[PDB]
Write a protein that holds these residues in place. Structure first.
Motif, mmCIF file in Angstrom:
data_model
loop_
_atom_site.group_PDB
_atom_site.id
_atom_site.type_symbol
_atom_site.label_atom_id
_atom_site.label_comp_id
_atom_site.label_asym_id
_atom_site.label_seq_id
_atom_site.Cartn_x
_atom_site.Cartn_y
_atom_site.Cartn_z
ATOM 1 N N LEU A 45 -6.932 -1.194 -5.776
ATOM 2 C CA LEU A 45 -7.621 -1.809 -6.850
ATOM 3 C C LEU A 45 -8.075 -3.266 -6.148
ATOM 4 C CD1 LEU A 45 -6.141 -1.187 -10.039
ATOM 5 C CD2 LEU A 45 -8.222 -0.388 -9.479
ATOM 6 N N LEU A 84 3.277 -6.514 -11.412
ATOM 7 C CA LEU A 84 2.646 -5.769 -10.607
ATOM 8 C C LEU A 84 1.609 -4.756 -11.683
ATOM 9 C CD1 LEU A 84 1.673 -4.885 -8.028
ATOM 10 C CD2 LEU A 84 3.122 -2.850 -8.104
ATOM 11 N N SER A 85 2.416 -4.256 -12.829
ATOM 12 C CA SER A 85 1.618 -3.686 -13.895
ATOM 13 C C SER A 85 0.615 -4.652 -14.427
ATOM 14 C CB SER A 85 2.361 -3.285 -14.906
ATOM 15 O OG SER A 85 3.097 -4.205 -15.583
ATOM 16 N N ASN A 113 -2.298 -5.183 -12.179
ATOM 17 C CA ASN A 113 -3.042 -3.945 -11.987
ATOM 18 C C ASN A 113 -4.031 -3.777 -13.347
ATOM 19 O OD1 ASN A 113 -2.401 -2.907 -9.556
ATOM 20 N ND2 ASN A 113 -0.668 -1.714 -10.354
ATOM 21 N N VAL A 120 -12.378 4.789 -14.368
ATOM 22 C CA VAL A 120 -12.365 3.845 -13.227
ATOM 23 C C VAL A 120 -11.538 4.743 -11.959
ATOM 24 C CG1 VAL A 120 -11.415 1.820 -12.435
ATOM 25 C CG2 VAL A 120 -12.341 1.945 -14.437
ATOM 26 N N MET A 121 -10.357 5.489 -12.317
ATOM 27 C CA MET A 121 -9.572 6.114 -11.406
ATOM 28 C C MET A 121 -10.433 7.488 -10.706
ATOM 29 S SD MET A 121 -6.989 4.594 -10.864
ATOM 30 C CE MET A 121 -6.084 3.092 -11.639
ATOM 31 N N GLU A 122 -11.424 8.013 -11.662
ATOM 32 C CA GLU A 122 -12.151 9.043 -11.095
ATOM 33 C C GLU A 122 -13.354 8.540 -10.010
ATOM 34 O OE1 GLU A 122 -14.505 10.495 -14.238
ATOM 35 O OE2 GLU A 122 -12.965 11.839 -14.642
ATOM 36 N N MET A 123 -13.589 7.060 -10.151
ATOM 37 C CA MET A 123 -14.714 6.612 -9.206
ATOM 38 C C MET A 123 -14.008 6.293 -8.018
ATOM 39 S SD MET A 123 -16.366 2.970 -10.059
ATOM 40 C CE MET A 123 -17.023 3.159 -8.382
ATOM 41 N N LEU A 124 -12.537 5.979 -7.994
ATOM 42 C CA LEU A 124 -11.875 5.338 -6.897
ATOM 43 C C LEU A 124 -11.673 6.573 -6.198
ATOM 44 C CD1 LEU A 124 -12.052 2.357 -8.484
ATOM 45 C CD2 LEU A 124 -9.806 2.197 -7.421
ATOM 46 N N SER A 161 -11.702 -5.900 -14.953
ATOM 47 C CA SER A 161 -12.838 -6.348 -14.224
ATOM 48 C C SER A 161 -13.597 -5.395 -13.331
ATOM 49 C CB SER A 161 -12.511 -7.292 -13.223
ATOM 50 O OG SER A 161 -11.198 -6.812 -12.285
ATOM 51 N N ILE A 162 -12.868 -4.283 -12.921
ATOM 52 C CA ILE A 162 -13.464 -3.246 -12.382
ATOM 53 C C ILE A 162 -14.261 -2.554 -13.500
ATOM 54 C CG2 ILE A 162 -13.237 -1.113 -10.940
ATOM 55 C CD1 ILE A 162 -11.007 -2.419 -9.532
ATOM 56 N N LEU A 176 -6.889 -6.085 -12.784
ATOM 57 C CA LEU A 176 -8.012 -5.586 -11.862
ATOM 58 C C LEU A 176 -8.695 -4.552 -12.386
ATOM 59 C CD1 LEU A 176 -5.967 -5.532 -8.440
ATOM 60 C CD2 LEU A 176 -7.905 -6.978 -9.221
ATOM 61 N N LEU A 177 -8.055 -3.745 -13.443
ATOM 62 C CA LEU A 177 -8.723 -2.763 -14.056
ATOM 63 C C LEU A 177 -9.795 -3.043 -15.007
ATOM 64 C CD1 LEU A 177 -5.732 -0.170 -14.333
ATOM 65 C CD2 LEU A 177 -7.861 0.364 -13.268
ATOM 66 N N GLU A 192 -17.338 -4.194 -14.487
ATOM 67 C CA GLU A 192 -18.190 -4.446 -13.744
ATOM 68 C C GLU A 192 -18.960 -2.777 -13.359
ATOM 69 O OE1 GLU A 192 -19.010 -7.031 -11.669
ATOM 70 O OE2 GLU A 192 -20.753 -6.111 -10.518
ATOM 71 N N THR A 240 -9.268 5.634 -17.029
ATOM 72 C CA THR A 240 -9.388 7.004 -16.275
ATOM 73 C C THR A 240 -10.528 7.297 -15.594
ATOM 74 O OG1 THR A 240 -8.607 9.313 -16.394
ATOM 75 C CG2 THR A 240 -9.761 8.347 -18.134
ATOM 76 N N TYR A 277 -11.588 16.428 -11.007
ATOM 77 C CA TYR A 277 -10.538 15.190 -11.210
ATOM 78 C C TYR A 277 -9.636 15.562 -12.193
ATOM 79 C CZ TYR A 277 -8.143 10.561 -11.210
ATOM 80 O OH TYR A 277 -6.938 9.875 -11.281
ATOM 81 N N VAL A 319 -16.364 -6.095 -6.503
ATOM 82 C CA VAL A 319 -16.408 -6.803 -7.777
ATOM 83 C C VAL A 319 -16.355 -8.206 -7.594
ATOM 84 C CG1 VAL A 319 -15.315 -6.782 -9.788
ATOM 85 C CG2 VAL A 319 -15.156 -4.802 -8.669
#
Lengths: 339, 48, 193
Positions: free
Chosen positions: C171, B16-17, B20, B39-43, B26-27, B23-24, B30, B37, C137, C179
């Motif tokens: 995600l 799972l890590s 994750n 990325v975790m702000e915008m989510l 690619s995000i 996915l991180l 993008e 961190t 945040y 994405v």
């Protein structure tokens, strides 16, 4: 993030091999020596898991000390990825190498200590890598502390006043990284710089204070109390981020842990011993070993007496409460009318 | 880009890590963000 | 019990009010008597300093076998927050209601294995209390680290197992909406696998 390799092939001629694990689209790469002499500048973004090579020169002024080779990948923006390795080089003729190799193999086989542990003992005693009588005294205390407190070798090194090792070996991360960087707090790596960490009781400090609390399993209040055990001369609760201050805090936490004490029970016991004004920052090897025997004697004695440190501190404290109780008031009325 | 090393063959980690992490990457690529961190702000803000 | 009859305000009653044998007043006398019995042999020194106005945080922490800075920081966070009735530096250790309020900052901090200002950082993340000044945040990220540092090794493994499962629901759903390329008809998380 990185694998850095340094290979000698002559006098002041070194091959620098390096490899990146993580990709950054970088404008250029800059390898610098002690952040002062730019060894290699490469104008591309380096690919991951490609072993790049470089021929550098290192004069004897740099060979003499542990030097640091830092690799900086500068993005098109102002951002820049950075990672560094600290190299310690030393040279021998073939006779003196095999004699020092003789001492290391004979001692590691007789003691069952790792050669990395034995190097941590030797560098803690003297600057040169020499085994002498003072080294073998710490080798005894290292073996004694494992047997007595059921701890590892690298933990017993800290009780023999050695620093926390940043050297990873036997396919384990270093003692530094398992203490401070497993896991990485919010993707941030904790390094030993010069940055100050405010360890006051009501600080609500940075993430670096959080690293100390996760490492030592204490809150802000016990971390400030651990600071005053380490140094009674801190006027503010601020220490620098270097490895000496991180080791001295870890000496004080280990002394509480190996005797099954809290930090508050440790401070009362160090007062109760007589070590209340001797700080663990500037302490000798002999004084530290004497202080552990005083703690080992009394903590084992408190179990046989079935007492607390709190019960011991009542009988031991020289600070007295100045509050007129009904018990004292009965003592004053009886001695008044009696005498 | 993966290294055929002894460590990538031997040491075990969470599936799972590793998912994750994929996915991180690619995000981040993008959204054109600095690190994970951000990325975790915008989510934390992303509604749709 | 002399002091509760004669000075009821020192136990949290209103000024000039006759005391109550109310059930809310019987429960505080029991919690006061349980508090005295927990002090043990130093209970006389605390109550003599409680009957006068001389009781301090350093003195009560000695009888409780707590750190003196723990009750100092718990008194500071009690005075800065809006309690009803308020905790003033005049009555911080004079009224029993203020002492009981300060000790609840201690018990919440011991439960979470944080400092009392870590609890204060946590109650500053209240949603409607911070509709004036919204926490960033970073403030959530700092408060998460403070709470994470108080975990032992088993709870940390339970923590990071739950976070990875929580991030994967986020995600994946973000990847599918935002994405993923349209040429791959990815609708569900099974299609993403």
């Amino acid at each position: 993030q990185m694998d850095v390799e340094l290979f000698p092939f002559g006098g002041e001629n070194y091959r620098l091999d390096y490899k990146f694990k993580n990709f950054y689209n970088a404008s250029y790469l800059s390898i610098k020596l002690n952040d002062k002499r730019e060894l290699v500048r490469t104008e591309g973004a380096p690919q991951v898991n490609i072993e790049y090579s470089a021929n550098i020169t290192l004069n004897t002024a740099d060979i003499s000390q542990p030097f640091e080779i830092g690799l900086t990948r500068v993005l098109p923006s102002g951002s820049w990825a950075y990672a560094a390795a600290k190299f310690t080089v030393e040279e021998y003729n073939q006779y003196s190498f095999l004699l020092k190799l003789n001492k290391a193999i004979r001692l590691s086989r007789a003691t069952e200590l790792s050669p990395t542990i034995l190097e941590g003992i030797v560098r803690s005693v003297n600057l040169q890598l020499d085994i002498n009588t003072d080294v073998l005294g710490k080798v005894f205390l290292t073996k004694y502390y494992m047997q007595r407190y059921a701890i590892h070798a690298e933990t017993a090194l800290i009780l023999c006043n050695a620093p926390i090792s940043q050297r990873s070996y036997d396919n384990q991360p270093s003692q530094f990284d398992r203490l401070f960087n497993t896991p990485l707090l919010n993707g941030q790596y904790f390094s030993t710089g010069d940055e100050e960490i405010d360890l006051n009781s009501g600080s609500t400090g940075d993430w670096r204070k959080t690293i100390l609390k996760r490492a030592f399993n204490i809150d802000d209040v016990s971390l400030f109390r651990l600071l005053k055990i380490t140094d009674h001369d801190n006027k503010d609760g601020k220490i620098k981020n270097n490895l000496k201050n991180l080791s001295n805090l870890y000496i004080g936490k280990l002394l509480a842990d190996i005797h099954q004490l809290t930090i508050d029970e440790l401070d009362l016991l160090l007062i109760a011993v007589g070590e209340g004004k001797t700080n663990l920052s500037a302490i000798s090897d002999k004084q530290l070993a004497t202080l552990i025997r005083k703690l080992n004697t009394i903590t084992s004695w408190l179990h046989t007496q079935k007492w607390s440190v709190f019960q011991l501190f009542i009988m031991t404290s020289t600070s007295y409460n100045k509050t007129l109780t009904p018990e004292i008031k009965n003592l004053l009325d009886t001695v008044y009318h009696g005498l | 880009s993966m290294a055929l090393s002894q460590q990538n063959m031997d040491i075990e980690l969470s599936t799972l890590s590793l998912s994750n992490e994929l996915l991180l990457e690619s995000i981040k690529t993008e959204s054109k963000l600095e690190n994970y961190t951000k990325v975790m702000e915008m989510l934390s803000t992303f509604r749709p | 019990f002399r002091l509760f009859v004669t000075k009821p305000e020192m136990f949290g009653a209103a000024t000039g009010a006759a005391p109550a044998h109310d059930a809310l007043s019987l429960i505080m006398l029991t919690r006061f008597a349980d508090w005295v019995n927990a002090l043990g042999e130093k209970a006389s020194s605390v109550l003599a300093a409680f009957e006068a106005n001389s009781l301090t945080a350093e003195q009560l922490a000695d009888a409780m076998n707590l750190d003196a800075n723990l009750l100092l920081q718990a008194s500071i966070q009690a005075q800065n927050h809006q309690h009803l009735p308020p905790v003033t530096p005049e009555n911080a250790f004079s009224c029993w209601t203020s002492i009981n309020t300060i000790l609840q900052w201690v018990n919440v901090a011991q439960q979470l294995n944080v400092a009392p200002q870590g609890v204060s950082a946590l109650v500053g993340l209240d949603y409607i209390q911070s509709m004036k000044e919204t926490p960033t945040y970073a403030q959530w990220e700092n408060a998460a680290g403070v709470l994470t540092a108080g975990l032992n090794s088993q709870q940390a493994n339970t923590l990071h197992a739950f976070l990875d499962e929580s991030r994967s629901a986020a995600l994946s759903t973000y990847y599918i909406r935002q994405v993923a390329k349209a040429a791959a008809a990815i609708k569900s998380r099974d299609d993403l696998y």
